[PDB]
Design a protein around this ligand. Structure first.
Ligand code: SF4
Ligand code: SF4
Lengths: 198, 145
């Protein structure tokens, strides 16, 4: 199942064009350059994931461009303040295709604990989001898990190989929800370690 | 209130027994010999007084059974620290004017007099340490000093 941006359609996928699409998806998902954009404390956890103890470079996602033109991924890591929302929208508009969005933390997801006069209640009110990370802040490995989720989403999307030939629509896979995928293992948990120890 | 052998040379009047720390009452005195444990005697008295509560007012109705349970624990050596202080506080707070009628001040007169005169028998029933709680696995208790 796929969603088309030019509706819910089926898979549009010759066998050489499928291999070319897989090669392009592999190259895109293994080379994701985030935009260096810091809103709040969630950005501290993101750049913590960039350091030696986590080494997000191992996934090939450490380049951290200062220009939106050179960046493939916008991580909204922090609160979408009302004064900063036009800035976020302009920076997202300055990014070039293909571009993906990770909303990081409760503030970027929904406004979080800041249901307040000066805060936009979630970045998905005005820009589309590919992966959401709950947490306040999410720990750096949660950001890495969301990066891997984005890689799985990229690895099965369909985009035009060229802008002069073929279908120009962007097809995104309707992936199974992580909640429903992990429900079988999560409900089966019985005992946990007592909180009196280290 | 209980009186000792030194109070036997006192005239049976309201004023004389009143200043000795007791009441003349019905003037039908009861003698307690050396073979009678004072804690068991006051337990019997408080059991009578607690079960004869009319139940109207809180201090008598809900504080006399507490004294009964404390005295029952002291009788079999199951008393815990703070029990005698609880009995003394019950005696102070069940006095005249605190309860609706005079049943409970009369109830706590022998308890306070026996604690005053025979405190060594009430202290002898305190053997176990104070334990009001049980352990809950996973929650570290707040260890008060
Ligand atoms: S979700 Fe929490 S940690 Fe992240 S920006 Fe908001 S307040 Fe900070
Ligand atoms: S002190 Fe008197 S009024 Fe109060 S409950 Fe006891 S018997 Fe009733």
């Amino acid at each position: 199942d796929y969603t088309l941006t030019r509706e819910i359609v089926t898979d549009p996928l010759n066998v050489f064009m499928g291999k070319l699409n897989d090669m392009v998806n592999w190259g895109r998902k293994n080379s994701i350059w985030p935009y260096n954009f810091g809103l709040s404390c969630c950005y501290v956890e993101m750049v913590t994931s960039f350091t030696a103890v986590h080494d997000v470079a191992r996934f090939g996602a450490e380049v951290l461009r200062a220009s939106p033109r050179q960046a493939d991924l916008m991580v909204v890591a922090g609160t979408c303040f009302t004064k900063m929302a036009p800035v976020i929208q302009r920076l997202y508009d300055q990014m070039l295709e293909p571009k993906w969005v990770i909303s990081m933390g409760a503030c970027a997801n929904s406004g979080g604990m800041y249901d307040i006069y000066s805060v936009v209640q979630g970045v998905d009110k005005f820009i589309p989001v590919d992966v959401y990370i709950p947490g306040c802040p999410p720990r750096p490995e949660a950001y890495m898990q969301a990066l891997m989720l984005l890689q799985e989403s990229i690895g099965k999307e369909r985009r035009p190989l060229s802008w002069v030939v073929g279908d120009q629509g962007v097809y995104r896979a309707n992936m199974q929800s992580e909640r429903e995928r992990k429900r079988g293992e999560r409900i089966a948990v019985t005992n946990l370690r007592t909180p009196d120890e280290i | 209130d209980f009186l000792t052998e030194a109070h036997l040379d006192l005239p049976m009047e309201f004023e004389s027994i009143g200043k000795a720390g007791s009441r003349l009452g019905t003037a039908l005195a009861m003698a307690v010999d050396h073979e009678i444990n004072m804690v068991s005697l006051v337990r019997n008295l408080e059991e009578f007084f607690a079960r004869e509560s009319c139940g109207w007012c809180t201090p008598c109705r809900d504080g006399l059974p507490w004294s009964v349970k404390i005295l029952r624990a002291l009788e079999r050596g199951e008393g815990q620290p703070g029990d005698i202080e609880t009995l003394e506080q019950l005696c102070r707070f069940l006095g005249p004017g605190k309860t609706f009628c005079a049943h409970a001040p009369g109830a706590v007169e022998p308890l306070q007099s026996a604690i005053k005169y025979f405190r060594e028998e009430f202290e002898a029933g305190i053997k176990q340490p104070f334990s009001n709680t049980h352990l809950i696995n996973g929650i570290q208790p707040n260890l008060l000093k």
